[PDB]
Scaffold this motif. Structure first.
Motif, PDB file in Angstrom:
ATOM      1  N   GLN A 136       0.771  -1.222   0.000  1.00  0.00           N
ATOM      2  CA  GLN A 136       0.000   0.000   0.000  1.00  0.00           C
ATOM      3  C   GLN A 136       0.811   1.285   0.000  1.00  0.00           C
ATOM      4  O   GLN A 136       0.258   2.383   0.104  1.00  0.00           O
ATOM      5  CB  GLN A 136      -0.978  -0.035   1.172  1.00  0.00           C
ATOM      6  CG  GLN A 136      -2.120  -1.019   0.898  1.00  0.00           C
ATOM      7  CD  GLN A 136      -3.080  -1.211   2.057  1.00  0.00           C
ATOM      8  OE1 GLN A 136      -3.032  -0.564   3.101  1.00  0.00           O
ATOM      9  NE2 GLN A 136      -4.026  -2.150   1.889  1.00  0.00           N
ATOM     10  N   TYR A 137       2.145   1.210  -0.112  1.00  0.00           N
ATOM     11  CA  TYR A 137       3.061   2.283   0.210  1.00  0.00           C
ATOM     12  C   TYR A 137       2.959   3.530  -0.657  1.00  0.00           C
ATOM     13  O   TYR A 137       3.527   4.566  -0.307  1.00  0.00           O
ATOM     14  CB  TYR A 137       4.489   1.751   0.117  1.00  0.00           C
ATOM     15  CG  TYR A 137       4.822   0.469   0.850  1.00  0.00           C
ATOM     16  CD1 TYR A 137       4.165   0.109   2.030  1.00  0.00           C
ATOM     17  CD2 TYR A 137       5.833  -0.350   0.337  1.00  0.00           C
ATOM     18  CE1 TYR A 137       4.476  -1.093   2.682  1.00  0.00           C
ATOM     19  CE2 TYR A 137       6.175  -1.548   0.998  1.00  0.00           C
ATOM     20  CZ  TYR A 137       5.486  -1.922   2.167  1.00  0.00           C
ATOM     21  OH  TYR A 137       5.814  -3.099   2.784  1.00  0.00           O
ATOM     22  N   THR A 185      -0.330   4.094  -2.390  1.00  0.00           N
ATOM     23  CA  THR A 185      -1.760   4.223  -2.543  1.00  0.00           C
ATOM     24  C   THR A 185      -2.406   4.767  -1.279  1.00  0.00           C
ATOM     25  O   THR A 185      -3.214   5.696  -1.333  1.00  0.00           O
ATOM     26  CB  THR A 185      -2.386   2.884  -2.923  1.00  0.00           C
ATOM     27  OG1 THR A 185      -1.950   1.886  -2.033  1.00  0.00           O
ATOM     28  CG2 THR A 185      -1.981   2.456  -4.330  1.00  0.00           C
ATOM     29  N   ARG A 186      -2.009   4.247  -0.116  1.00  0.00           N
ATOM     30  CA  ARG A 186      -2.450   4.720   1.192  1.00  0.00           C
ATOM     31  C   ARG A 186      -2.068   6.170   1.396  1.00  0.00           C
ATOM     32  O   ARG A 186      -0.916   6.569   1.209  1.00  0.00           O
ATOM     33  CB  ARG A 186      -1.885   3.798   2.266  1.00  0.00           C
ATOM     34  CG  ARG A 186      -2.320   4.191   3.671  1.00  0.00           C
ATOM     35  CD  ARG A 186      -1.754   3.243   4.721  1.00  0.00           C
ATOM     36  NE  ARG A 186      -2.478   1.965   4.759  1.00  0.00           N
ATOM     37  CZ  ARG A 186      -3.268   1.540   5.745  1.00  0.00           C
ATOM     38  NH1 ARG A 186      -3.459   2.231   6.879  1.00  0.00           N
ATOM     39  NH2 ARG A 186      -3.899   0.367   5.612  1.00  0.00           N
ATOM     40  N   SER A 187      -3.061   6.976   1.787  1.00  0.00           N
ATOM     41  CA  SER A 187      -2.920   8.379   2.124  1.00  0.00           C
ATOM     42  C   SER A 187      -2.200   9.240   1.093  1.00  0.00           C
ATOM     43  O   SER A 187      -1.653  10.279   1.447  1.00  0.00           O
ATOM     44  CB  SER A 187      -2.300   8.530   3.513  1.00  0.00           C
ATOM     45  OG  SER A 187      -3.050   7.795   4.455  1.00  0.00           O
ATOM     46  N   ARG A 222      -2.789  12.867   1.218  1.00  0.00           N
ATOM     47  CA  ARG A 222      -2.973  13.286   2.596  1.00  0.00           C
ATOM     48  C   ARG A 222      -1.719  13.267   3.454  1.00  0.00           C
ATOM     49  O   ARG A 222      -1.602  14.103   4.339  1.00  0.00           O
ATOM     50  CB  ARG A 222      -4.066  12.451   3.256  1.00  0.00           C
ATOM     51  CG  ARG A 222      -5.477  12.845   2.813  1.00  0.00           C
ATOM     52  CD  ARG A 222      -6.510  12.022   3.576  1.00  0.00           C
ATOM     53  NE  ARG A 222      -7.879  12.427   3.263  1.00  0.00           N
ATOM     54  CZ  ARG A 222      -8.651  13.282   3.946  1.00  0.00           C
ATOM     55  NH1 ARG A 222      -8.206  13.937   5.025  1.00  0.00           N
ATOM     56  NH2 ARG A 222      -9.913  13.499   3.570  1.00  0.00           N
ATOM     57  N   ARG A 223      -0.784  12.353   3.212  1.00  0.00           N
ATOM     58  CA  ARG A 223       0.367  12.118   4.057  1.00  0.00           C
ATOM     59  C   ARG A 223       1.427  13.222   4.036  1.00  0.00           C
ATOM     60  O   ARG A 223       2.260  13.270   4.933  1.00  0.00           O
ATOM     61  CB  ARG A 223       0.976  10.756   3.739  1.00  0.00           C
ATOM     62  CG  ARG A 223       1.631  10.686   2.364  1.00  0.00           C
ATOM     63  CD  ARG A 223       2.297   9.345   2.098  1.00  0.00           C
ATOM     64  NE  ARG A 223       2.926   9.321   0.782  1.00  0.00           N
ATOM     65  CZ  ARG A 223       3.943  10.104   0.389  1.00  0.00           C
ATOM     66  NH1 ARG A 223       4.685  10.833   1.229  1.00  0.00           N
ATOM     67  NH2 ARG A 223       4.238  10.199  -0.920  1.00  0.00           N
ATOM     68  N   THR A 252       5.148  12.813   5.381  1.00  0.00           N
ATOM     69  CA  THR A 252       5.215  11.549   6.089  1.00  0.00           C
ATOM     70  C   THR A 252       5.119  10.355   5.149  1.00  0.00           C
ATOM     71  O   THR A 252       4.730  10.522   3.990  1.00  0.00           O
ATOM     72  CB  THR A 252       4.182  11.451   7.207  1.00  0.00           C
ATOM     73  OG1 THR A 252       2.876  11.330   6.685  1.00  0.00           O
ATOM     74  CG2 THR A 252       4.193  12.651   8.153  1.00  0.00           C
ATOM     75  N   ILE A 253       5.477   9.161   5.594  1.00  0.00           N
ATOM     76  CA  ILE A 253       5.500   7.950   4.793  1.00  0.00           C
ATOM     77  C   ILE A 253       4.731   6.804   5.431  1.00  0.00           C
ATOM     78  O   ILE A 253       4.784   6.584   6.640  1.00  0.00           O
ATOM     79  CB  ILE A 253       6.926   7.528   4.418  1.00  0.00           C
ATOM     80  CG1 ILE A 253       7.861   7.411   5.610  1.00  0.00           C
ATOM     81  CG2 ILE A 253       7.472   8.472   3.355  1.00  0.00           C
ATOM     82  CD1 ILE A 253       9.207   6.762   5.280  1.00  0.00           C
ATOM     83  N   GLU A 254       4.025   6.048   4.588  1.00  0.00           N
ATOM     84  CA  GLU A 254       3.133   4.965   4.955  1.00  0.00           C
ATOM     85  C   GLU A 254       3.819   3.624   4.727  1.00  0.00           C
ATOM     86  O   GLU A 254       3.480   2.889   3.807  1.00  0.00           O
ATOM     87  CB  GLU A 254       1.850   5.128   4.136  1.00  0.00           C
ATOM     88  CG  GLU A 254       0.997   6.315   4.559  1.00  0.00           C
ATOM     89  CD  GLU A 254      -0.009   5.989   5.648  1.00  0.00           C
ATOM     90  OE1 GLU A 254       0.183   4.987   6.371  1.00  0.00           O
ATOM     91  OE2 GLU A 254      -1.055   6.679   5.696  1.00  0.00           O
ATOM     92  N   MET A 255       4.889   3.349   5.479  1.00  0.00           N
ATOM     93  CA  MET A 255       5.802   2.255   5.231  1.00  0.00           C
ATOM     94  C   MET A 255       6.354   1.622   6.502  1.00  0.00           C
ATOM     95  O   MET A 255       6.525   2.326   7.494  1.00  0.00           O
ATOM     96  CB  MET A 255       6.989   2.745   4.414  1.00  0.00           C
ATOM     97  CG  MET A 255       6.603   3.339   3.052  1.00  0.00           C
ATOM     98  SD  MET A 255       8.014   3.606   1.952  1.00  0.00           S
ATOM     99  CE  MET A 255       7.293   4.809   0.810  1.00  0.00           C
ATOM    100  N   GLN A 293      11.448   3.315   8.338  1.00  0.00           N
ATOM    101  CA  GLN A 293      11.451   4.592   9.028  1.00  0.00           C
ATOM    102  C   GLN A 293      11.958   5.752   8.188  1.00  0.00           C
ATOM    103  O   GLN A 293      11.540   6.891   8.379  1.00  0.00           O
ATOM    104  CB  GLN A 293      12.298   4.450  10.286  1.00  0.00           C
ATOM    105  CG  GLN A 293      11.749   3.480  11.335  1.00  0.00           C
ATOM    106  CD  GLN A 293      10.496   3.973  12.043  1.00  0.00           C
ATOM    107  OE1 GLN A 293       9.958   5.047  11.792  1.00  0.00           O
ATOM    108  NE2 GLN A 293       9.949   3.187  12.977  1.00  0.00           N
TER     109      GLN A 293
END
Length: 53
Positions: free
Chosen positions: A6-7, A9-11, A14-15, A18-21, A24
């Motif tokens: 999802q890295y 597609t998610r947010s 919106r992110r 920031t990172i959706e992973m 770190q």
């Protein structure tokens, strides 16, 4: 295509910075900021054990 993680597609819209992973860091400003923070807290440590102790 087919999704497998999802890295990207998610947010996505919106992110912002920031990172959706599960990782770190992915960009070198993150890496160099923690490098500078490590240098600064190491400098603070050796200042204390030479000038307060």
């Amino acid at each position: 295509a087919m999704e497998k993680v999802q890295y990207l597609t998610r947010s996505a819209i919106r992110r912002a910075s920031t990172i959706e992973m599960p990782q770190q860091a992915r960009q070198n400003l993150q890496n160099l900021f923690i490098n500078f923070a490590l240098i600064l807290i190491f400098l603070l440590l050796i200042a204390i054990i030479v000038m307060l102790l």
